Amino acid sequence: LVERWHFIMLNDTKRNTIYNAAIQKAVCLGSKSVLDIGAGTGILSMFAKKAGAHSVYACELSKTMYELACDVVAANKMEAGIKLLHTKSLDIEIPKHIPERVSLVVTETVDAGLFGEGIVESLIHAWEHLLLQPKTNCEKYGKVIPASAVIFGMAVECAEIRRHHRVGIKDIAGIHLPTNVKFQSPAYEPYTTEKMSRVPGGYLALTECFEIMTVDFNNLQELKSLATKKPDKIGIPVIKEGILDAIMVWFVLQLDDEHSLSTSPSEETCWEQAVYPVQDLADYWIKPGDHVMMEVSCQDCYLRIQSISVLGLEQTCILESTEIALLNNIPYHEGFKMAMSKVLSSLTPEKLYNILEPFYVLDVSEGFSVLPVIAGTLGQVKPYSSVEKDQHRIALDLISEANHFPKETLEFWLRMLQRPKSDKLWSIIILDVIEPSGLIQQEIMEKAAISRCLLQSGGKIFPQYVLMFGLLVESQTLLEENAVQGTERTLGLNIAPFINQFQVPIRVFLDLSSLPCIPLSKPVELLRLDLMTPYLNTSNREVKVYVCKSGRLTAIPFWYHMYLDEEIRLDTSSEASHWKQAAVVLDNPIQVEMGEELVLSIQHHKSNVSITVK
Numbered sequence: 009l010v011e012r013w014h015f016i017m018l019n020d021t022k023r024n025t026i027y028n029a030a031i032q033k034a035v036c037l038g039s040k041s042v043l044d045i046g047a048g049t050g051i052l053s054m055f056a057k058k059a060g061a062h063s064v065y066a067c068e069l070s071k072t073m074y075e076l077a078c079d080v081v082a083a084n085k086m087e088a089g090i091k092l093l094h095t096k097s098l099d100i101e102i103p104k105h106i107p108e109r110v111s112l113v114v115t116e117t118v119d120a121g122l123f124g125e126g127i128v129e130s131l132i133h134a135w136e137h138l139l140l141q142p143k144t145n146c147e148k149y150g151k152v153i154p155a156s157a158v159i160f161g162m163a164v165e166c167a168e169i170r171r172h173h174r175v176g177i178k179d180i181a182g183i184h185l186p187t188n189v190k191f192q193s194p195a196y197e198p199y200t201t202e203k204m205s206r207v208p209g210g211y212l213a214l215t216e217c218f219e220i221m222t223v224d225f226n227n228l229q230e231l232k233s234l235a236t237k238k239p240d241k242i243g244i245p246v247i248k249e250g251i252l253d254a255i256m257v258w259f260v261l262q263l264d265d266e267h268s269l270s271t272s273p274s275e276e277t278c279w280e281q282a283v284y285p286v287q288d289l290a291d292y293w294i295k296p297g298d299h300v301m302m303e304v305s306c307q308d309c310y311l312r313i314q315s316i317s318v319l320g321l322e323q324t325c326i327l328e329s330t331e332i333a334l335l336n337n338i339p340y341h342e343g344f345k346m347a348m349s350k351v352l353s354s355l356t357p358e359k360l361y362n363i364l365e366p367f368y369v370l371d372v373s374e375g376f377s378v379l380p381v382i383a384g385t386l387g388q389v390k391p392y393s394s395v396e397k398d399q400h401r402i403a404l405d406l407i408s409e410a411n412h413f414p415k416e417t418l419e420f421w422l423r424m425l426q427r428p429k430s431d432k433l434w435s436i437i438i439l440d441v442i443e444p445s446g447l448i449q450q451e452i453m454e455k456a457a458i459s460r461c462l463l464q465s466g467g468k469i470f471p472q473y474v475l476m477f478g479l480l481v482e483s484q485t486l487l488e489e490n491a492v493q494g495t496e497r498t499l500g501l502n503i504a505p506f507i508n509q510f511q512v513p514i515r516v517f518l519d520l521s522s523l524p525c526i527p528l529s530k531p532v533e534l535l536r537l538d539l540m541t542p543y544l545n546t547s548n549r550e551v552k553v554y555v556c557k558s559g560r561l562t563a564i565p566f567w568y569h570m571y572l573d574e575e576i577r578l579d580t581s582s583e584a585s586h587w588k589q590a591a592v593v594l595d596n597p598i599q600v601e602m603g604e605e606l607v608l609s610i611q612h613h614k615s616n617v618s619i620t621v622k
């Protein structure tokens with residue numbers, strides 16, 4: 009309900025201090041009438057009032073955030089001086105919502121790409137309807153904090169970004185990906201966002217930092233012009249050999265002459281960068297002498313970088329990032345090849361590489377999957393794909409052709425779980441068990457139980473079972489993302505007890521490998537989800553975890569080993585995993601001692617798992 013950024017930004021003392029100092033300066037120079045656009049909990053509005061502003065107006069788009077801001081403003085005894093408005097800034101009218109035009113607008117409607125929260129649209133409206141005229145004293149003319157911003161770019165090598173946007177291989181577990189199928193991510197999604205200061209495997213600067221654009225938030229003509237301004241065509245010198253994976257983008261906010269904020273990548277700051285993946289080139293290798301060329305525009309809200317190309321000295325298949333990461337997950341496909349060949353082998357080795365009767369193999373993977381083609385290559389197999397999108401069907405037809413399938417070897421199941429034919433049964437059913445989120449898929453136990461009945465004698469659900477592993481960690485990061493840590497970070501203002509009512513018990517879409525934390529235990533098996541034998545499912549159980557190290561336990565990250573058979577397991581935490589992980593974050597951190605035996609109480613019901621300290 010409450011975006012994680014509200015917790016991180018409220019816990020950033022440095023940022024609170026700098027916004028307070030800028031709002032203080034402006035108010036005491038006589039900006040005593042303030043509109044806070046995107047107020048969240050209302051901390052900037054409370055800075056303005058306490059700085060001596062006469063009237064403060066705070067608008068917030070989210071019902072949840074507006075109600076929270078009402079509660080926080082009241083709790084800090086500022087109900088009377090601060091008018092909270094449940095409204096998009098665009099829908100503020102004078103005198104209906106605000107009595108008079110205001111001397112100061114403060115806005116934190118800002119994303120990693122600066123523009124992605126509609127600031128340009130808001131400030132154009134603000135200048136036109138809501139602000140006093142600009143300077144041609146301070147009580148008599150309109151001004152905006154932030155005043156202006158410089159946007160910076162850098163060409164980078166980053167395999168972690170690459171593996172989500174480009175398919176890196178021509179051959180997966182003995183199937184050929186044909187040249188005549190081009191895979192593109194959806195960023196070909198104007199950008200992704202990334203804490204680049206700790207992206208798994210890091211990044212390499214291939215160019216110097218280069219200025220992309222400047223913006224003056226106090227110049228209405230300039231903001232009005234962005235909409236129709238001709239894209240800047242630019243060309244950036246290469247200073248290092250490497251693979252061109254992305255343009256990394258950040259910015260400096262000038263709040264006023266003396267106060268600025270940088271979203272430059274750093275472990276010292278909370279800020280993320282905008283990331284523009286590079287794809288649909290013949291070659292990605294760049295070296296000193298080359299230029300990185302691109303068009304930069306800001307016409308329809310977002311900063312777009314397009315036509316990214318390298319100046320030196322054919323069916324398209326759109327995949328989600330998860331599906332691109334999947335095709336780049338080699339051990340996943342090699343596991344399936346091996347484990348499928350073993351199940352085929354132990355049921356009819358004669359049909360592995362009644363003659364007319366194949367192995368029937370059903371793939372119920374959620375999205376795009378090449379498992380059926382891999383199954384196809386193993387023996388006399390009739391493989392079934394569960395792809396819905398026409399584009400996926402065409403790609404798989406073309407991949408089939410490239411691996412010497414006769415036409416209509418690969419069948420499409422959608423074009424309910426049922427028998428393959430009237431009096432026939434499945435040799436393998438593949439179920440999708442774990443969400444990209446790192447949570448167990450809903451209704452999986454139902455799908456398993458239905459699927460069990462539809463199997464040939466000695467046939468298998470893949471995976472047969474799944475072990476969930478956990479780790480005791482001390483993570484201040486996970487804590488500061490989860491909960492405001494008291495009053496001192498918000499400069500005495502009392503916000504934590506109100507926002508912390510919206511603590512999430514579980515952080516999903518977590519990159520474990522990147523996480524700054526201290527391990528307090530070794531991995532430990534937390535529960536078994538067994539698709540072949542439901543009786544082995546952990547109902548409710550306690551787990552004794554040996555504490556290897558003294559620390560403040562804040563979280564229990566968790567991932568899965570998915571067993572295709574007893575020898576072959578997939579790791580959702582693997583380097584190349586197309587799954588994210590998750591973590592239980594404690595409402596209250598617990599202190600643990602080396603030698604202690606901590607008890608986790610683990611409640612499991614369907615696809616939901618409670619994990620608690622006892």
Ligand SMILES: CCc1ccncc1CNCCCCSC[C@H]1O[C@@H](n2ccc3c(N)ncnc32)[C@H](O)[C@@H]1O
Nearest residue numbers: 013046048067068069070096097117118119120279280
């Ligand atoms: C330095 C920024 C940064 C840089 C790098 N990495 C991360 C960040 C952090 N950015 C967090 C985005 C937070 C989301 S926007 C903040 C609040 O404003 C609200 N809103 C949005 C538009 C809007 C409107 N026109 N009228 C009223 N309210 C509005 C949202 O409902 C939200 O509560």
